[PDB]
Ligand SMILES: */C(=C/C(=O)N1CCN(CC2CCN(c3cc4c(cc3F)C(=O)N([C@@H]3CCC(=O)NC3=O)C4=O)CC2)CC1)[C@H](C[C@H]1CCNC1=O)NC(=O)[C@@H](CC(C)C)NC(=O)OCc1ccccc1
């Protein structure tokens with residue numbers, strides 16, 4: 001038993017990380033087949049980043065202005081092009097460790113693993129949710145851009161995130177692997193607001209179910225509620241509104257624990273209105289919203305990867 | 307910026323995981339050079355585990371009673387022996403993906419990465435501390451035994467943990483890779499007590515320093531204290547007593563933040579005595595003790611692995 005924030009094994013993605021240098025900027029790139037993907041802002045100087053004209057900047061760059069290194073081997077760059085906010089560097093060699101993979105654009109509230117890298121060398125792995133406001137709360141230092149996020153379905157890596165920025169609030173922003181930002185952000189060093197950060201209500205409910213499965217139960221009260229009633233309390237606390245879709249997704253956990261979803265809502269409502277009274281749930285003193293229903297089922301069925 | 311519980315990249319350890327079956331029990335083994343390490347209780351039936359005589363049980367087992375599988379390839383077992391609570395299975399093939407590695411026995415309060423596995427297939431990676439009472443709080447289901455914990459120093463994997471058991475309190479227990487349990491536990495299905503679980507005071511202080519580095523500062527008060535004075539307050543809250551060794555270890559963070567360690571102690575003391583007043587620190591509503599001074603420095607310097 002027990003329940004922890006857990007990242008996917010990172011082996012398949014480690015084999016795809018490289019170092020991309022242009023001028024004096026170095027960051028990470030993702031090397032799949034004969035293409036290297038990295039943030040287009042590799043082409044910027046510190047001065048450029050205040051207000052870049054990427055199209056004009058890229059025009060000054062040739063294939064040979066891009067240095068790609070895998071360990072100690074230099075890849076030859078035979079083509080380059082800008083897709084939205086990502087630069088695509090064509091090389092003369094297919095990565096012999098390319099896993100089976102997809103590019104996917106994930107939905108708010110979904111989770112994924114980040115392999116944080118510096119100089120194209122993996123540093124560490126942690127779990128992130130795409131928050132409702134299209135930021136993540138990660139751990140990113142200078143040189144970490146180009147680090148990716150991903151999910152694995154058995155042997156298929158689904159890439160969903162590439163790291164580009166930190167906002168003034170200290171949270172993080174980035175693109176899918178087609179170079180389209182999550183959220184209303186742009187790859188420019190200017191003040192940018194993410195909206196109000198709402199809580200992923202369905203995720204909190206899954207975690208409460210997880211808690212019940214791991215024997216955490218003080219919080220289970222004797223009330224039930226309605227979808228509309230709970231949601232009037234959700235909005236007050238900046239919780240995402242709950243839908244029958246969400247109820248159905250929680251269906252397996254509800255069916256396993258024997259707790260109707262609307263009963264768990266009633267218990268969550270009282271949690272929201274009365275706080276935790278200095279207690280903890282699965283080892284936390286606040287309500288956790290970065291575990292999907294899938295994340296908890298995974299960790300109750302013992303799904304493995306190959 | 308930002309600060310997260312982060313596991314080491316798991317690629318080098320993934321290549322060492324195999325499946326070990328004996329009779330009808332299946333669990334994980336670690337395949338390094340031409341040896342496979344796994345918990346000796348692979349040789350037990352469900353009935354055996356109530357009171358096993360391992361020596362008598364092992365006597366009935368031959369080399370051929372052990373099935374070792376790497377993916378779909380069966381390794382041939384040419385020798386077996388019991389070292390403490392681990393079984394060592396000699397095979398006719400050296401693992402071609404054996405990384406550089408060490409066996410180390412870690413100290414209480416230190417941290418390490420767990421690669422949770424089932425059927426010799428990696429499932430996920432998370433970070434654990436060897437608590438002062440020699441348990442860990444992990445996420446382990448049936449079939450997860452033989453999963454290992456490790457640290458990486460650049461290219462060297464230091465193996466320090468193999469998973470064996472869950473205690474009645476829901477926490478986890480296991481051995482070093484020489485098969486010696488951490489703590490007073492035995493590989494038998496009987497009620498076993500870990501003592502009082504104390505908090506790793508030095509770790510909490512490192513995390514408070516991390517918080518300061520990431521801009522969390524309400525908790526910084528105007529008091530200082532003495533080592534003996536703080537420790538009189540530590541013991542009351544079941545905190546580990548703080549020593550000049552601990553002070554020195556925090557020296558780099560103290561020197562970077564400009565906060566004397568004893569000032570941080572005074573702030574921690576008031577945190578302990580007055581609680582958090584519904585506030586949070588680095589996104590948590592309680593005091594975190596599973597980040598070592600090394601874990602926070604790592605995440606402030608951007609150390610990478612190769
Ligand atoms: C992600 C990636 C990124 O693009 N950068 C760019 C800046 N930086 C690299 C710096 C490092 C210092 N510097 C420099 C570097 C190098 C040399 C000289 C030099 F002056 C140099 O010679 N070399 C190599 C190696 C060293 C050497 O000796 N010889 C060489 O030839 C150098 O490498 C200039 C370049 C790294 C970051 C970040 C992600 C941030 C969030 C997470 N933490 C972050 O910093 N950059 C951005 O996000 C940035 C994108 C722009 C809009 C284009 N925006 C941003 O987030 O800014 C706000 C911010 C920044 C930091 C913290 C908080 C907020």
Ligand SMILES: */C(=C/C(=O)N1CCN(CC2CCN(c3cc4c(cc3F)C(=O)N([C@@H]3CCC(=O)NC3=O)C4=O)CC2)CC1)[C@H](C[C@H]1CCNC1=O)NC(=O)[C@@H](CC(C)C)NC(=O)OCc1ccccc1
Pocket residue numbers: 001330331332333347348350352355446447448449450451452470471472473478492493494495496
């Ligand atoms: C770690 C490892 C471990 O050794 N075990 C042993 C028991 N279990 C395997 C079971 C599973 C059910 N069962 C069985 C298995 C298989 C077949 C038939 C069958 F009846 C079978 O035919 N096969 C294969 C595959 C299936 C098939 O169709 N054909 C085959 O041939 C089978 O595999 C009997 C064997 C898995 C666990 C755990 C770690 C615990 C902590 C973390 N979660 C845990 O469960 N075991 C222990 O820790 C245990 C060690 C003993 C002291 C020796 N002690 C313990 O923790 O017990 C208390 C406890 C247990 C669970 C939860 C909480 C507390």
